[PDB]
């Protein structure tokens, strides 16, 4: 359908097991009123490559910022040459909460994260399962850092 937003983000992959070590992938994200989709970006030709996956907008319960990592690697650190840094540095995380727990996405800028959150909140406005609570920190190594709850589906420890 009609593309609301199109961006290059760093995403934290869903793992085989919660113990398994984290993997981050650079992908192009597409937002429509029906889907949040992601692709392997074709840099050379300047196009979206292969679709890797999608989340139905109706399945989204929450969209918020996430408290940043205590000590991120350079790829997720605050930058400097604008065209370059907007595709190399991804310091601003946000979460897309759905059926299969939270999806963690890293924006190159604060402004782009704000645009994505603003638009994602609007496309989810008429959803049923919209939660009023959320986890401000990341689920990492079998637990959320903000409340120590050990279930990805656990109810939010903070009111939004
Ligand atoms: C990233 C991943 O590992 N799995 C998944 C599913 C849907 C989206 Br939009 C993104 C990701
Ligand atoms: Mg560089
Ligand atoms: Zn929490």
């Amino acid at each position: 359908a009609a593309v609301i937003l199109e961006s290059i983000f760093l995403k934290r992959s869903q793992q085989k097991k919660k113990t398994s070590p984290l993997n981050f992938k650079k992908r192009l994200f597409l937002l429509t009123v029906h889907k949040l989709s992601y692709y392997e970006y074709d840099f050379e030709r300047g196009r979206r490559g292969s679709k890797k996956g999608s989340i139905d907008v109706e399945k989204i319960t929450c969209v918020e910022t996430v408290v940043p990592e205590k000590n991120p690697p350079p790829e997720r650190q605050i930058p400097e040459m604008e065209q370059i840094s907007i595709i190399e540095r991804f310091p601003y995380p946000f979460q897309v909460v759905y059926d299969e727990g939270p999806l963690y996405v890293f924006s190159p800028t604060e402004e782009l994260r704000k645009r994505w959150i603003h638009q994602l909140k609007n496309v989810i406005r008429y959803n049923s399962d919209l939660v009023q609570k959320y986890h401000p920190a990341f689920w990492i190594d079998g637990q959320y850092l903000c409340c120590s709850q050990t279930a990805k589906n656990a109810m939010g420890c903070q009111i939004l």
Side-chain angles (χ1 to χ4, degrees), residues 6-123:
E6 188 187 39
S7 289
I8 286 152
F9 289 149
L10 204 77
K11 67 173 255 95
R12 199 181 91 175
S13 279
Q14 233 79 52
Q15 304 302 328
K16 296 190 165 187
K17 49 182 194 164
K18 64 184 176 189
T19 61
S20 185
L22 312 175
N23 217 265
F24 293 83
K25 279 155 177 169
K26 202 178 284 189
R27 297 292 182 242
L28 167 141
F29 279 74
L30 215 65
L31 180 61
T32 64
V33 289
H34 193 41
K35 263 165 188 73
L36 176 57
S37 59
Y38 87 110
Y39 304 76
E40 203 162 344
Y41 180 68
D42 178 359
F43 175 78
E44 266 270 21
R45 293 185 290 202
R47 61 181 67 140
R48 328 192 171 110
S50 340
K51 187 172 156 276
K52 296 283 275 189
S54 76
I55 302 170
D56 269 60
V57 161
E58 44 198 307
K59 292 218 226 188
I60 300 158
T61 69
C62 188
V63 176
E64 263 310 318
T65 57
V66 195
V67 171
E69 294 161 293
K70 300 153 204 285
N71 283 101
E75 194 169 37
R76 312 188 292 275
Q77 275 178 24
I78 308 171
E80 194 283 284
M81 192 99 36
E82 201 160 37
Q83 174 199 45
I84 298 310
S85 74
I86 218 168
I87 56 158
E88 291 190 0
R89 282 178 195 271
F90 302 90
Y92 306 100
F94 63 92
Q95 52 188 308
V96 179
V97 189
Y98 65 111
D99 184 1
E100 295 161 59
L103 166 67
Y104 301 112
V105 176
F106 299 76
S107 181
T109 71
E110 265 198 296
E111 299 70 50
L112 198 50
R113 175 174 67 183
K114 188 194 146 202
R115 288 215 275 147
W116 273 77
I117 292 167
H118 276 221
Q119 299 305 325
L120 271 156
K121 274 179 189 301
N122 180 56
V123 307

Side-chain angles (χ1 to χ4, degrees), residues 134-137 144-149 155-158:
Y134 82 118
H135 298 281
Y144 282 99
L145 287 197
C146 40
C147 57
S148 310
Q149 289 203 69
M155 171 184 279
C157 69
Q158 224 212 312

